[PDB]
Design a protein around this ligand. Structure first.
Ligand code: NAG
Ligand code: NAG
Lengths: 115, 115
């Protein structure tokens, strides 16, 4: 199904990182591994990632310009199921839900791809 | 790979329970679902379960009579990679590692099976 060390949920594979990068640097790596910063499509993909990820904040793959809709990796509009709190431009997961911060700060990250 | 709500690791599927049973009652359920109380074979299967399981203690599928070796579901000897602490007869996972307690106390549980 999924590579060693990668974890699978709902016909899917996610990497949780050991180190801390800024948001774009984290994108490049995920990509380098044929993958993307988690796209958090499902409400359960959220919960799963919250449960597995641990106490550190982790970048996920939503961003936005100041006024704008959260947009996925590719550039599309995010179907706004759950909140994304804060006033950042980069979306991250905290302990309990999704939130936002400046993209240049460093944070562990999660990678999404397929089986 | 694995049923809805079940999570996969290392060519494997695990259920994490929502409720609290005693050890044997937890065995019966896992079985009812063509599964066993996690057998914790790997050192990474440990870490994975610790990371996913959450703050509640969870029964896993090792037991022993008083003096004896930890024995799997079937009845065999457990290859003693990691500690199992305490003086219980039923093995459980706490926050940080494996431990042991009386089998009749109630605890969430984890189920192991295959893909
Ligand atoms: C992210 O950090 C890298 C260091 O690996 C650095 O080259 C770069 O300045 C940062 N990227 C952005 C967009 O600030
Ligand atoms: C476990 O609990 C069940 C209640 O579901 C009960 O029937 C039984 O007394 C308990 N089993 C053991 C081995 O104590």
């Amino acid at each position: 199904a999924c590579p060693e060390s990668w974890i699978g949920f709902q016909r899917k594979c996610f990497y949780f990182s050991d180190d801390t990068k800024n948001w774009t640097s984290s994108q490049r790596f995920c990509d380098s591994q044929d993958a993307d910063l988690a796209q958090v499509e499902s409400f359960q993909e959220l919960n799963f990632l919250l449960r597995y990820k641990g106490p550190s904040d982790h970048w996920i793959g939503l961003s936005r310009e100041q006024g704008q809709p959260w947009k996925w990796i590719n550039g599309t509009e995010w179907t706004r199921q759950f909140p994304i709190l804060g006033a950042g431009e980069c979306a991250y997961l905290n302990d309990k839900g999704a939130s936002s911060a400046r993209c240049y700060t460093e944070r562990k990250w999660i990678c999404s791809k397929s089986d």
